[PDB]
Amino acid sequence: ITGTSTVGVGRGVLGDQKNINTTYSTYYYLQDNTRGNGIFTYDAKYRTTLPGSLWADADNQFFASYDAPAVDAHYYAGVTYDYYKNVHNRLSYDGNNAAIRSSVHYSQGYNNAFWNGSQMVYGDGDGQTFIPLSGGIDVVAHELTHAVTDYTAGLIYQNESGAINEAISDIFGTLVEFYANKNPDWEIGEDVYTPGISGDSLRSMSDPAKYGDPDHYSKRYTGTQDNGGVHINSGIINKAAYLISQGGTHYGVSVVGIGRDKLGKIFYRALTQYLTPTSNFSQLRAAAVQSATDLYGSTSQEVASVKQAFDAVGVK
Ligand SMILES: CC(C)C[C@H](NC(=O)[C@H](C)NP(=O)(O)CNC(=O)OCc1ccccc1)C(=O)O
Ligand SMILES: [Ca+2]
Ligand SMILES: [Ca+2]
Ligand SMILES: [Ca+2]
Numbered sequence: 392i393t394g395t396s397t398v399g400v401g402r403g404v405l406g407d408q409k410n411i412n413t414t415y416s417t418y419y420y421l422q423d424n425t426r427g428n429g430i431f432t433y434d435a436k437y438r439t440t441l442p443g444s445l446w447a448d449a450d451n452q453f454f455a456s457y458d459a460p461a462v463d464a465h466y467y468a469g470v471t472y473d474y475y476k477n478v479h480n481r482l483s484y485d486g487n488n489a490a491i492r493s494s495v496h497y498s499q500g501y502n503n504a505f506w507n508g509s510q511m512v513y514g515d516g517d518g519q520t521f522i523p524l525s526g527g528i529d530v531v532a533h534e535l536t537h538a539v540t541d542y543t544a545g546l547i548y549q550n551e552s553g554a555i556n557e558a559i560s561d562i563f564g565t566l567v568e569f570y571a572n573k574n575p576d577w578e579i580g581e582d583v584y585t586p587g588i589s590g591d592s593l594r595s596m597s598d599p600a601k602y603g604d605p606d607h608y609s610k611r612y613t614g615t616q617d618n619g620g621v622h623i624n625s626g627i628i629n630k631a632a633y634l635i636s637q638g639g640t641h642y643g644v645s646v647v648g649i650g651r652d653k654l655g656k657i658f659y660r661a662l663t664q665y666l667t668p669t670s671n672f673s674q675l676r677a678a679a680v681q682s683a684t685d686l687y688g689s690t691s692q693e694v695a696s697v698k699q700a701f702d703a704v705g706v707k
């Protein structure tokens with residue numbers, strides 16, 4: 392909507408107060424004009440028609456329980472925008488400042504979040520398995536990263552290309568979590584998963600096997616559930632990414648870590664310059680090795696460590 396840019400205040404899903412960029416025109420809307428062509432957050436009102444209505448508030452104060460998932464969807468989309476722009480010089484998911492749209496309160500008891508081809512969508516969870524999923528900055532950045540992938544490599548969402556698609560979203564969701572630097576970790580979704588159980592997560596990048604997922608190509612899933620295991624076989628690439636950044640010895644193979652920023656640079660370059668819709672895991676290795684060669688030189692430590700990491704997870 393046309394209006395004037397304002398700053399609202401509210402509380403997110405976990406009870407933290409934060410400022411949000413809004414737009415005033417009769418109501419205060421969750422429309423952030425300070426980032427590209429806008430960040431826009433909508434109310435799906437427990438239904439499944441999308442996007443629903445642009446979020447409207449009478450007084451620019453967002454402290455109701457019902458407000459909290461919108462506060463966080465809106466705010467964390469802003470953080471993710473800033474990450475891509477400041478770290479990778481990328482303007483929104485299309486590189487041309489496309490408007491970022493999110494809907495919250497999608498459906499009833501909905502234990503998931505997704506990118507539907509055009510926008511981000513967040514369930515509230517059933518209150519047992521999940522609390523509102525936009526409370527997880529890694530989840531919001533995971534979702535926005537699906538849009539980045541679709542506009543760049545275009546990795547098909549099945550089998551190995553789909554597992555790379557998933558891992559790219561977990562990798563940048565985690566790098567955004569570290570960028571924001573509030574309780575960052577290599578786990579996915581810990582802030583919104585199972586509020587009555589402490590210390591668990593949807594997935595772990597450091598030890599994928601803790602939550603059922605393979606950490607080596609020899610343990611890859613090859614059945615048809617989950618689009619050919621895209622959220623399962625993602626553990627093999629997540630483990631490789633973790634090793635590249637943090638180092639370790641895995642199945643007897645030692646990897647010298649090179650840190651988060653170089654991990655992010657290598658995979659951002661791979662994603663945008665080398666991967667294709669049908670890339671498999673071996674082609675991702677090649678893409679990562681070439682990206683690291685471009686950035687740091689064919690004899691660099693960084694190239695050695697990417698090779699080490701893919702060796703450790705069995706991907707040649
Ligand atoms: C328990 C559940 C949240 C675990 C998992 N989901 C995730 O890890 C994250 C949060 N969501 P996501 O973006 O990967 C789900 N994606 C998804 O449903 O893709 C299907 C799709 C939806 C819309 C258009 C095209 C394809 C999953 O969907 O299995
Ligand atoms: Ca209000
Ligand atoms: Ca965390
Ligand atoms: Ca996390």
Ligand SMILES: [Ca+2]
Nearest residue numbers: 584585586588
């Ligand atoms: Ca939990």
Ligand SMILES: [Zn+2]
Nearest residue numbers: 533537557560
């Ligand atoms: Zn995903």
